[PDB]
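Retro notes
What went well: the complex prediction finally ran end to end.
Inputs used:
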Amino acid sequence: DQSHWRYGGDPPWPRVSPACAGRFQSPVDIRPQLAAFCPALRPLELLGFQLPPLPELRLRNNGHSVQLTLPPGLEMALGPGREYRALQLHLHWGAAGRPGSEHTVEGHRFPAEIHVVHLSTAFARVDEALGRPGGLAVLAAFLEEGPEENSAYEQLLSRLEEIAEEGSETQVPGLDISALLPSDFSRYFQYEGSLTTPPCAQGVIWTVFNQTVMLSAKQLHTLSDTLWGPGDSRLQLNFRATQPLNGRVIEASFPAGV
Amino acid sequence: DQSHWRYGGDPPWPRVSPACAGRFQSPVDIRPQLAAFCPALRPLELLGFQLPPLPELRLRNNGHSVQLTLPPGLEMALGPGREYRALQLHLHWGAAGRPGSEHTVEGHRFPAEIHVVHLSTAFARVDEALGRPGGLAVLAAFLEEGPEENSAYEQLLSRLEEIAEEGSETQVPGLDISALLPSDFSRYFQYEGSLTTPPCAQGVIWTVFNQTVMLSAKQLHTLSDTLWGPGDSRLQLNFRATQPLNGRVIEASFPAGV
Ligand SMILES: *[C@@H]1O[C@H](CO)[C@@H](O[C@@H]2O[C@H](CO)[C@@H](O[C@@H]3O[C@H](CO)[C@@H](O)[C@H](O)[C@@H]3O)[C@H](O)[C@H]2NC(C)=O)[C@H](O)[C@H]1NC(C)=O
Ligand SMILES: *[C@@H]1O[C@H](CO)[C@@H](O[C@@H]2O[C@H](CO)[C@@H](O)[C@H](O)[C@H]2NC(C)=O)[C@H](O)[C@H]1NC(C)=O
Ligand SMILES: [Cl-]
Ligand SMILES: [Cl-]
Ligand SMILES: [Cl-]
Ligand SMILES: [Zn+2]
Ligand SMILES: [Zn+2]
């Protein structure tokens, strides 16, 4: 099986996909004081993210996260000339007493992280974009613990019980995908990295919101303690360690220093 | 598993895909004097089709045809703002003493037919375009018998012995894909139809050149007598019968009643 891997042990990821031994991998530790302010980095523009209930969307436990398949027509602009089509979103989380975001900020790990994965409009096929500079783009936001339930996230978290078993899937109504993300589109970090799971292909443009999304502690428990993974254990701690920068400069869309 | 079907045998295709029993199926019999002449149909334009030798391209015997995977960056323009990205091309053929084109012209079947399959620039995923109006576009040309060896086709036909076994594949150098097609881009027929294999999804824009391409008899034999298919039988007669019009209008880009 050329396509099986897990978090927390063998097979080593470079054996699954040699590209996971690359020099420009994700995730990374973001150090705001050392991020370079770039004023050409304009507010992100999201088109078509406010979905009606029909058509419904596939929601699947793939053993590695819960993944929501997005319909056609969702467009994300990093800028004019950097236009992307959204494919799917999924999440990374921890466990009882343990945060599980993938990116960190000055070494701080947040409770969880949402990824929205996009294909550059240059491509008709995700597989052709793998490893090509700017072929894929991921929008990432941190999920922080707060006192109030997040109603937008409850639409998905309340359905995880239906897909607890690995490989199981269900259909959920369309929802406002942009309500899963922060409201500030103007403050973000941006750098070039990789997919954070095998095949770990490089050339991915990462955009990480500076503003967090708040979930209740009960919601974060629902996320991290409902799903089962490969080989009968709870799907938890499904994040990768941060990776060497190897000379990369993380850019900021706002003066990030103090 | 439902990705399973054959030419001229069980399972009956509407079992494979009920969509194959649709009202707007392909191929069709083209009747030039009854096509609607539409002067708004502009000459076709192909961008990026003149490939360099590297990178190489996958050439595969999939048991239903020989299929060449096209690299990123190839586009077909059907009209202002109406672009499609080329994914792959494949062929349909007959047998000893038998033509095997899919489309016919006034009931005449040509020796063989080439299809270049494209995805509308609105989509990032072929699977999402299936069944959607205008989501896919196929460019088709007839292959006719002539006295001279076709040098462009010889680049592919000379490699079929390498992929005689069903499911085998090899790599071929990039070539000028437009040299596999007629040079007259101004005279063609166009109509809305379906994929001609399961899942027979409708909404496909078909464009059929009026000018033919010529292959030698000894090339047409190579095409039709080299590959093996399902069962232990030769891959031959790999075309679908023409389908009822059901009130569809076939358009012509040129006065075809003249
Ligand atoms: C969003 O970006 C802002 C910068 O505009 C980040 O705020 C910066 O965060 C760091 C880490 O929290 C703060 O450093 C800390 O300062 C405290 C107080 O002195 C110190 O005790 C800690 O040891 C640490 O050095 C930094 O001051 C803060 N800067 C500003 C201007 O507020 C923030 O982290 C970003 N958040 C995300 C999620 O990206
Ligand atoms: C290309 O179009 C021409 C017409 O412009 C077709 O030629 C006609 O064919 C029909 C029936 O076969 C005859 O009525 C005509 O006498 C032919 N007309 C002319 C003007 O030559 C031709 O069949 C088309 N070929 C293809 C492959 O589409
Ligand atoms: Cl590298
Ligand atoms: Cl592509
Ligand atoms: Cl799509
Ligand atoms: Zn992810
Ligand atoms: Zn075909």
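What we learned: Chain B touches chain A at residues 71-73, 85, 87, 119, 121-126, 128-129, 132 (CB under 8 Å).
What to try next: split runs per interface for comparison.
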